[PDB]
Design a protein around this ligand. Sequence first.
Ligand SMILES: Nc1ncnc2c1ncn2[C@@H]1O[C@H](COP(=O)(O)OP(=O)(O)OP(=O)(O)O)[C@@H](O)[C@H]1O
Ligand SMILES: Nc1ncnc2c1ncn2[C@@H]1O[C@H](COP(=O)(O)OP(=O)(O)OP(=O)(O)O)[C@@H](O)[C@H]1O
Ligand SMILES: [Mg+2]
Ligand SMILES: [Mg+2]
Lengths: 564, 562
Amino acid sequence: IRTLLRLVPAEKRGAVAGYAVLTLLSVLLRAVGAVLLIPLLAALFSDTPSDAWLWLGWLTAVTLAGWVTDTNTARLGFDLGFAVLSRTQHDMADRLPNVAMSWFTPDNTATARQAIAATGPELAGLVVNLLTPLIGAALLPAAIGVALLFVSVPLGLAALAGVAVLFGALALSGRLSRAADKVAGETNSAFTERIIEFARTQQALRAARRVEPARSQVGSALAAQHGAGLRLLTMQIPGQVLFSLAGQVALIGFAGMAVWLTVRGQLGVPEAIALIVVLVRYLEPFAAIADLAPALETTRATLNRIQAVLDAPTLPAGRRRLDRTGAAPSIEFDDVRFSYGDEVVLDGVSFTLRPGNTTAIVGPSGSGKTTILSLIAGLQQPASGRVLLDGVDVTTLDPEARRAAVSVVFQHPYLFDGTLRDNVLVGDPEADPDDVTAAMRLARVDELLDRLPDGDATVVGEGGTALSGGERQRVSIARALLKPAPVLLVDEATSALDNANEAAVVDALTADPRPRTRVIVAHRLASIRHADRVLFVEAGRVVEDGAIDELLAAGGRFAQFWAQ
Amino acid sequence: AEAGSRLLAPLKKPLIVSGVLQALITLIELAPFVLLVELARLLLGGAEAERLWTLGLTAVSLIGLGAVLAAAMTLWLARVDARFAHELRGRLLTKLSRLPLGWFTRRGSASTKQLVQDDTLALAYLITAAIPDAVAAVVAPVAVLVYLFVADWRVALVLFIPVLVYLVLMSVMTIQSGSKIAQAPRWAERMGGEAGAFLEGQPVIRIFGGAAASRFRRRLDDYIDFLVSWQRPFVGKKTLMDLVTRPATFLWIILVAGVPLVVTGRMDPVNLLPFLLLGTTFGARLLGIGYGLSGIQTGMLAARRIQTVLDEPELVVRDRTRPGTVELDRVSFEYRPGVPVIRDVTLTLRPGTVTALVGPSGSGKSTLAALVARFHDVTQGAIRVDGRDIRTLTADELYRRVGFVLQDAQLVHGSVAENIALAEPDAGLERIRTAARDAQIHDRITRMPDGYDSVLGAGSALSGGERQRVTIARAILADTPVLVLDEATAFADPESEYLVQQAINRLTRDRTVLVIAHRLHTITHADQIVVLDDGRIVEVGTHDELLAAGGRYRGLWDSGRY
Ligand SMILES: Nc1ncnc2c1ncn2[C@@H]1O[C@H](COP(=O)(O)OP(=O)(O)OP(=O)(O)O)[C@@H](O)[C@H]1O
Ligand SMILES: Nc1ncnc2c1ncn2[C@@H]1O[C@H](COP(=O)(O)OP(=O)(O)OP(=O)(O)O)[C@@H](O)[C@H]1O
Ligand SMILES: [Mg+2]
Ligand SMILES: [Mg+2]
């Protein structure tokens, strides 16, 4: 195969050659071991059987050297399979946090999930279970043919004729079944994605009665997945028939040329009898290739998914760094433009944030507020224009410095499955417990510790599913505040919290003792308390901006926003 | 396994047939070599040509017959499995449609996908090839070895040596990797969970920790370290079994035990013919079952995991056996035993009455809404809609009676129309636009490229406020007697929130409504405001009455102004 030699490490290319040399050597030893029965039995049946010892000794030397070769190529294939497994997986794990957000379409996300889901033993045992026996079965009929040229040239050519039939059948079997095998993979992938939606969206589906398989989209996907599954089973009938014809055609050719030589005296009777066993050894790779041929197309799709992930467009980056790690940077946008596909979110927003102060952003739903925060935090990047941290373009900044210079509170607080403390410690794992306790206290997560039975060991579910809407929001705020980065971004921290908890969190977002440049995306007039500056964003541009009192006195769009 | 045998009851007769058919097929596949042996004996004897032709052509045809029968049986037997997997995936999706939602939350979407797809797919070997291989590995070696035993015992007892070494290799491989086989599906679920959260929680990982510090990668390394420890001794034994059972190993050890007998006056070279022709044939039968023992183990465990879900408590619809009235009577609920979440709540919702359920975060208000929808079953007391117990209503009757918005704007992978029309998929575009216009999201959908067919896949096409307005659009189109709003318009700005609430008031002026909202100033006009604090009804009354009472609601209201 051609894609596996690309995914293989540059370190292991020495080991790849040792694999290739030994797998060829095993094929030659297996063919020579098969063909060594011809002179062995020819001498065994003769009037002097003692001459059989020479070929038996050669047979023992050839077969024991097979075991050493096949054991060594198995160890090498095991290493190369796991070296490819570790290498490809770590490259997908390193690349995916750098991939552009636009790459995560519903199809690509399924591809990434499937590619990551190939970490199981099936991909690890690629070389041992597929390529070693595929190469062995593809070349052993050819090797047995070449080994028979020493016995009789016309017979060796007959076997090579049967080899050409084999490779023809192998090429055609893949050709016929490829159209149906693609559809089987597409339908099976969609079925997986719909099971995940089915389990994640159980609440909404059940209320809408789209949960039973007769009416559910997962139930339809199971029907299409079954239709394509059965079609593939039928469309693989030509492949099995064609291999069976190839195995029979080669049997007639090899057996015919053996009897044509035997009657004419060019081959003795014992050589013909030995050739029956060599024919059987020669015919086994025909059936084995039929068993391995279906696996070749699945693995080709699997490596195509992994290669799709690795070829994904990473985000631009440089190697710059901020002047100071912990000092408050100045954030500014300079004709930043952005667009999700054809839809345009920002049309040249331009603003400047003084370092250490707190600023607020407000505007109608879908205006672009979370887009502005994502550009600040580096999740997105502009189609054109620049976002500067302390005068340093985000695009030219090192990934590690860019990641460490921002902590954000997301609109839809996602917590990873695991305990409550683990999600808090994600902000800064090295932090001592005194900083962790201070982070929780500021976020009113201490109230969860009192009320909840397991305290900080509370096992959150998938996402923040096993916590309240406000409880997961508070855990997210504690995670964000724990990170010591000098910029803090708040995206609807007031959405899911009662009036008492909202006031405590709003007070604590500004009462944090570290110096940071704060951007607040709030909802209420009271949620923007202690805000030095406010930016009104509407239709993708900052239409109005100023202080709370100044904008209220002006009676502009800001005042009309609260009037409903 | 009772949990597996109970599941594979429907395929009793397809499996018994496959066992018998493989018994005949292997005998048919061994028949040519018995003929080719007879062809060989007569060649030394120089018999008449037509006799040799008859043995030659019958042997070649029986090879064709055996390949056709073995091929045809694998076509049928694969199709039988594909039909059982389709049915069994149907049974699972029907079961999970009935379980309480506690099953889903404590389990995760990764474990369900393993259940529906990977566990059913794991049964493929157990149905399609386990009993064929088991019968083939029994009769073809037994037939071959017994025939070879009659031919010559000396070379026959030497054939035991590859066989016994193979048995020890497979027994040692099985006991060694058995523990790893049990731990394997749990590891796959955990990494399935970590892979899912890694893709879904990408904005978090991109900022808090990055690639190296990610808990996905730390688990990824641990999984690969589990795989290496599992697969090194396993693959290390697999190739040892391949080497021992190969035709070349049988052919070499036959010649080693025969050639010294041929050279001495102890065995004729003609009696070697059965062994060289048949003795090398039965290795691939033993090698099939040896590689299949792990497939059976994953199959039996997958069957046990599937049947364990198929006997789960089902949220049954019992046969015990005012319009729009919902009554909660002494209702108590616990997500897990030992912690009370709801404590003896008693509340009555009547037609044409807007009820506001407010209180501290984590007080249980969304849990009450979940009990009205019957995602979970109350641990005490009863819930009755229009005077009929919810546990007696069927899901179609229940969900035709109540409509829901659930605070988590989940959207299904499909068009916006396939999300707005989720309740009534047959509903026309004229209703879908009318629902969206009333939910105040039609302006957004018009500006999309595909219009009302634009796809809403993973993390696409909508923001948080816009995702909710789709969900309210869905609830409007369902058009049920009762409506339950769990923090609807939480992300909606005041200009849009007023328009949406005005639409809901217009649509539900004679419908039971249960508004849940933390913003107390948006529920100033509920005819009754229920205060839920720590899972109990601490006070009930109008807005003005609760302010005068000076209790929990007065504190929350005063604390709202900051
Ligand atoms: N993943 C996405 N793909 C395509 N368009 C998107 C995506 N996320 C948001 N949009 C669109 O971008 C525009 C602004 O989205 P954004 O997430 O910035 O909203 P927002 O300002 O946070 O609003 P809200 O108050 O509703 O949360 C809207 O048109 C929204 O539909
Ligand atoms: N699926 C769940 N599994 C376990 N505990 C849960 C689950 N859902 C909620 N809880 C817990 O039940 C209690 C109340 O949960 P619930 O979702 O009813 O809160 P709530 O009052 O609706 O919250 P909010 O006002 O923040 O939306 C809290 O302890 C919460 O942690
Ligand atoms: Mg947003
Ligand atoms: Mg809630």
